């Protein structure tokens, strides 16, 4: 217990293993420690560490936070096998600056702390504005098909798809930088919606099962096609493919022959329940598909690229399943049909499974989205049983339930 072994990081990246005195204060060791690393660098033939102007030598955690000079290594949360960093920190002492007239003072100080508008950001705003404009256009064009069987909706939306896709293609070919790519991606993603509803609206007659088959199909194809040629925004495109795919299976069954929606809704729920277990494998195999390369950060390059791609696919896949379960689950439970209490308890246990499963993944966002998927279902069920079968007790009880639900968990964890 008299000493502990740790790996120390030195200049430009050399790691050296050292056995430190566990009880002397850190300030007594920093000086001789610097001598040792210099000896090893010199024998290695590298340039030794040197001071630059004004500053001091410090020992810090790999996060950069310096250790308290008066404390013993055992007093701090340092254990054998950890790693530390020796670093040179420059002096910050300097003259101050004053300004006498308040108007000039306000202008000078305020212009340093913040960033003003520039032409680079200006384009992203315009691109986002046109994207909102077209999704509203398909909204109005889509609504007309619900009251009239004329060809208008498909004809008009088709030209929109072409125009938007046309601009997107040129931008995609001429692009040079990430900012340019952001603009291009926004434009391309905006083309999927008009092209999709342009097709689904073509079959004449009242809207229903036959129209659904066309819509979700082309949608799934478009997202898959974009993902194949672009190789960016993996998560969102993955999510669109899943909801489009599963919806297409039900639509075809409903279009050909289906005894009841409850049968289809129960089937999807069961598929989704097993799909959660398949999700990590799917992500892992999908990462092997060959598509272009753009990093978010020589053999190391390939490993990191593979790692981030796989992680990205899992989040989108998890999200798509979450969306399907809540839509189906809220449709399956009912306050008037038969054993009204049976689906309520079944939904609770179904929610508990995801609430517990969140611990199997170390990632912050992945665990949070899983956790969030459970909470929303519980609240949604209460709302359903609050709107329908409405009465003072139900609303009063639903409120009590919803306020207590999260409160118990937070209080038990924070206090």
């Amino acid at each position: 217990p008299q000493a502990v072994v740790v790996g120390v990081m030195a200049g430009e990246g050399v790691q050296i293993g050292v056995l430190l005195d566990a009880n002397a204060p850190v300030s007594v060791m920093t000086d001789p420690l610097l001598k040792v690393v210099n000896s090893r660098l010199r024998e290695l033939g590298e340039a030794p560490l040197e001071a630059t102007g004004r500053g001091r030598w410090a020992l810090c955690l790999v996060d950069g936070a310096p250790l308290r000079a008066t404390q013993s290594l055992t007093e701090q949360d340092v254990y054998d096998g950890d790693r530390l960093w020796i670093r040179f920190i420059a002096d910050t002492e300097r003259r101050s600056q004053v300004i006498e007239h308040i108007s000039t003072a306000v202008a000078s100080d305020l212009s340093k702390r913040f960033a003003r508008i520039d032409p680079i950001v200006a384009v992203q705003v315009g691109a986002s504005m046109v994207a909102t404009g077209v999704v509203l256009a398909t909204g109005v064009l889509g609504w007309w098909r619900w009251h009239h069987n004329t060809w208008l909706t498909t004809i008009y939306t088709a030209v929109i798809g072409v125009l938007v896709l046309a601009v997107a293609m040129l931008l995609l070919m001429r692009a040079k930088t990430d900012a340019d790519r952001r603009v291009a991606d926004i434009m391309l993603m905006s083309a999927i919606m008009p092209v999709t509803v342009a097709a689904a609206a073509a079959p004449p007659g009242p809207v229903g099962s036959p129209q659904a088959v066309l819509g979700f199909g082309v949608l799934t194809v478009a997202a898959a096609l974009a993902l194949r040629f672009t190789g960016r925004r993996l998560g969102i495109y993955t999510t669109i493919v899943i909801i489009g795919a599963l919806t297409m299976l039900a639509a075809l069954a409903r279009m050909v022959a289906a005894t009841s929606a409850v049968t289809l809704l129960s089937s999807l729920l069961l598929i989704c329940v097993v799909a959660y277990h398949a999700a990590p494998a799917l992500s892992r195999r999908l990462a092997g598909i060959r598509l272009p390369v753009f990093p978010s950060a020589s053999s190391v390059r390939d490993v990191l690229l593979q790692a981030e791609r796989a992680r990205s696919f899992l989040s989108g896949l998890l999200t798509g399943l979450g969306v399907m379960v809540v839509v189906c689950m809220t449709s399956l439970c009912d306050p008037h049909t038969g054993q009204r209490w049976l689906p309520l308890i079944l939904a609770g246990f179904t929610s508990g499974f995801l609430l517990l499963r969140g611990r199997s993944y170390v990632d912050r966002w992945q665990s949070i989205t899983l956790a969030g998927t459970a909470v929303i279902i519980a609240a949604a069920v209460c709302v359903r049983y609050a709107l329908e079968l409405s009465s003072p007790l139900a609303v009063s009880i639903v409120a009590a339930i919803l306020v207590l639900l999260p409160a118990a968990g937070m209080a038990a964890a924070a206090h």
Partner: protein, 50 residues
């Protein structure tokens, strides 16, 4: 108001001229009289016993 506006502008340029001169003194004085805690690491440099 125009004379006032012009007058204010002339005062600003003197402010800038004074500030550069001040930095030169800070740099020079600091160059000869560092903070006491930084003196240990400087022991090997030629600035010692200068």
């Amino acid at each position: 108001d125009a004379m006032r506006a012009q007058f204010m502008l002339m005062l600003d340029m003197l402010r800038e001229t004074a500030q550069e001169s001040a930095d030169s003194m800070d740099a020079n004085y600091r160059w000869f009289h560092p903070a006491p805690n930084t003196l240990a690491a400087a022991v090997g440099s030629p600035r010692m016993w200068e």
